Amino acid sequence: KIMKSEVLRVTHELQAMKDKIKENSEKIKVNKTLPYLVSNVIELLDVDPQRKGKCAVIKTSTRQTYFLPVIGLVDAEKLKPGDLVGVNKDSYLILETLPTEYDSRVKAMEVDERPTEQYSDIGGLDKQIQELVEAIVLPMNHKEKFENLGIQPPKGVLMYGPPGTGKTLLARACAAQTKATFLKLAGPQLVQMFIGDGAKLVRDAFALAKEKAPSIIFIDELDAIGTKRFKAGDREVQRTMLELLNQLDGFQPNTQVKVIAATNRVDILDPALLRSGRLDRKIEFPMPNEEARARIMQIHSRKMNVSPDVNYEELARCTDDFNGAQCKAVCVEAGMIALRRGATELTHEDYMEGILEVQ
Amino acid sequence: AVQKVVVHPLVLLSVVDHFNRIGKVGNQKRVVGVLLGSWQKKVLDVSNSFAVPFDEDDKDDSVWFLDHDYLENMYGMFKKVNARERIVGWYHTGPK
Amino acid sequence: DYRKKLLEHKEIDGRLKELREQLKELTKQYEKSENDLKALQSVGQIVGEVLKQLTEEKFIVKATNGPRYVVGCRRQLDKSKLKPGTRVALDMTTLTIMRYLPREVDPLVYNMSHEDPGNVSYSEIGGLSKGCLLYGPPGTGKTLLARAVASQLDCNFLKVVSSSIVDKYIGESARLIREMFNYARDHQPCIIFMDEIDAIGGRRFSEGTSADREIQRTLMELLNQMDGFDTLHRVKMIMATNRPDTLDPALLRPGRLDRKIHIDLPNEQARLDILKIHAGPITKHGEIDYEAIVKLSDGFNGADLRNVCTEAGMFAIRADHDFVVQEDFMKAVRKVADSKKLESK
């Protein structure tokens, strides 16, 4: 072991390095304390002919352009043309780069942490919603098994069906089970007065989904803008829409946060919406029958003082060709006039009274 | 390797300081100073320097006294205030 | 007694030599920290532009902020890059010149940077041995192949999206056809991809409106630049689409689309090969039988065959079993594939 006795000197040199890094590593806090302004960064690779070529183009907020090479600490997500970077007083170095995404009108579209309703509020849809509950639970907790089996979850799910079916509140009810950040988005929000806004809205959605933590982005009324016209505004929605499809077709690192979509009608079905990353999950959600409407109305009305003498035959007969949110409006209306009816217990005539009241 | 060097008068005026801070003791030997410069480029450029207490023996010439802690502390603080210049060599004021 | 002390001391020396790798690896990064701290000392540089040069040594610079200045020449650089018309960089002190600044489009970096890695994709396309038509029979993979060779080399990333010919304003897209195709004629190597051409492939059977007439007019420029007075011997275009029925029979002339590649899974060796490349990272039981999956599958989509096989792997993960037998593959690829035949209208 006489040859291995020189390792002690090496360990003393290494622990001496750990003892001497406290000062030069300690000045990091006083030199990198606070970047006082914000400057935009534009990446431009240079060539010196070590003597290697590496530079970048800087733009300050006060419209002043300067010169500086790519410097700072170890960069992994950096080197992108972004803003909100660290800079000292006048030397103009890059110390702390953080993405900005400002235009809060699109950033703070729907800031929802988590909803209140859950998946246990409906009745008679487990045979078709269980695939979605799996498709949102197993891709969140079973990422470890995705390498043993080589499975990549789909990013486009088509939640299509007739309107008024409560698909929005049901997908949100599953978003409560996702436990991630819920972010709504409306179809008619892409159509703006100025040009090129849809690119900023789409790249903003993938800026918060790509940049931010694992979240949930549910959109609705996509059929209202998914028109395949052959000037025209829906062709501009073909520029923004086909741009989004290009970001769901040309991006292999799109294994991040999913994009859930729902269409209230399948009359104008875009044929280009068929792909593993695109809207491949096509589970048909028809109009619930009087049995299913009595189920979702019973579980949605399990909190009010409902009379126990309900055979569901009269309401099952009156509810003809109705939808989910319509029976939800009947439940809410019954909870509205049942107060002024004097009797605190919900009666049986209030069902047809609400049906003929709002419809 | 190196064709020419560049020496600023600041180090020689620091030798004027070597002759100033003597204190009239009667030794005036070859005080050795730690020469600093830029060895990165092919040409050598001396910016500034400092000194280290250096004393020899009267009879025996092989006696020489240097310091490692003072060199690492003065070089450490000087590198902390200015990291663009590092150690290159030394120099003595003796004519022989 | 003596023979065991050599192995024991070899074990003490082993656990003594196995602790250096936990430090000597991160000490390189710790020293790299001070290397960067010494690399951030080159600060205080500004930019400028050169318009008129009077003296060969000292010329006039034009700063971005608006005020103009004059600078000198540094002893290190030479007169090669000092010629006018090249954007350079300046210093706040003495207005010296460290190096130049090559111009680029703010957008030219985006148009010349998007790149896709992966070199095995060229050999992962399955058993598949001046224009190419990628039409849409019951089989997909039009993007995995174009992005497979495009991911291999492609010599560029000149992707042409069918949504870039919108032209919300007056339909003068001829400036973009001649501009981009003029870039194709300028750069000696060029590969053009035309994905989802069915949207801009209107058959103009009836009287088209102003929105259709401008797109068909861009098709008239395509005629004038394919069979007009301009050859395309060196450039190549890849017309990808979805339905091989409305593909502009005026454009279906064999003068442009030499060959037709029906992207399908006809051959049993192609379906078996694509099944094996998609069945790579999946683990299964010892009972393996691919001839039933390949035999029962008739005229399906490749990537959607991956979605049906992985859909059977999730049908098998519903019962949270680590091993996946091929029974759920035959019955789940069977039933789910029959649902794809139901939704194949």
Swiss-Prot record, chain A:
Belongs to the AAA ATPase family. The modification Phosphoserine is found at residue 307. ATP binds at residues 161-168. Component of the 26S proteasome, a multiprotein complex involved in the ATP-dependent degradation of ubiquitinated proteins. This complex plays a key role in the maintenance of protein homeostasis by removing misfolded or damaged proteins, which could impair cellular functions, and by removing proteins whose functions are no longer required. Therefore, the proteasome participates in numerous cellular processes, including cell cycle progression, apoptosis, or DNA damage repair. GO terms for biological process: blastocyst development; modulation by host of viral transcription; positive regulation of proteasomal protein catabolic process; positive regulation of transcription by RNA polymerase II; proteasome-mediated ubiquitin-dependent protein catabolic process. It is linked to Deafness, cataract, impaired intellectual development, and polyneuropathy: An autosomal recessive disease characterized by early onset of deafness, cataract, severe developmental delay, and severely impaired intellectual development. Patients later develop polyneuropathy of the lower extremities, associated with depigmentation of the hair in that area. PANTHER family: 26S PROTEASOME REGULATORY SUBUNIT (PTHR23073). It comes from the Eukaryota. SMART domains: AAA. Component of the 19S proteasome regulatory particle complex. The 26S proteasome consists of a 20S core particle (CP) and two 19S regulatory subunits (RP). The regulatory particle is made of a lid composed of 9 subunits, a base containing 6 ATPases including PSMC3 and few additional components. Interacts with PAAF1. Sumoylated by UBE2I in response to MEKK1-mediated stimuli. SUPFAM superfamilies: P-loop containing nucleoside triphosphate hydrolases. This is 26S proteasome regulatory subunit 6A. It holds the Pfam family AAA.
UniProtKB/Swiss-Prot annotation, chain B:
It comes from the Eukaryota. Residues 5-96 form the MPN domain. Component of the 19S proteasome regulatory particle complex. The 26S proteasome consists of a 20S core particle (CP) and two 19S regulatory subunits (RP). The regulatory particle is made of a lid composed of 9 subunits including PSMD7, a base containing 6 ATPases and few additional components. Within the complex, PSMD7 interacts with subunit PSMD4 through their respective MPN domain. Interacts with TRIM5. Component of the 26S proteasome, a multiprotein complex involved in the ATP-dependent degradation of ubiquitinated proteins. This complex plays a key role in the maintenance of protein homeostasis by removing misfolded or damaged proteins, which could impair cellular functions, and by removing proteins whose functions are no longer required. Therefore, the proteasome participates in numerous cellular processes, including cell cycle progression, apoptosis, or DNA damage repair. Does not bind a metal ion. Belongs to the peptidase M67A family. This is 26S proteasome non-ATPase regulatory subunit 7. It comes from Homo sapiens (Human). The gene is PSMD7.
From Swiss-Prot, chain C:
The keyword Membrane does not apply. The modification Phosphoserine is found at residue 206. It is found in: Cytoplasm; Nucleus. GO terms for molecular function: ATP binding; ATP hydrolysis activity; identical protein binding; proteasome-activating activity; protein-macromolecule adaptor activity. The modification N6-acetyllysine is found at residues 62, 168. Component of the 19S proteasome regulatory particle complex. The 26S proteasome consists of a 20S core particle (CP) and two 19S regulatory subunits (RP). The regulatory particle is made of a lid composed of 9 subunits, a base containing 6 ATPases including PSMC6 and few additional components. Interacts with PAAF1. Belongs to the AAA ATPase family. This is 26S proteasome regulatory subunit 10B. The lineage of its organism: Eukaryota, Metazoa, Chordata, Craniata, Vertebrata.
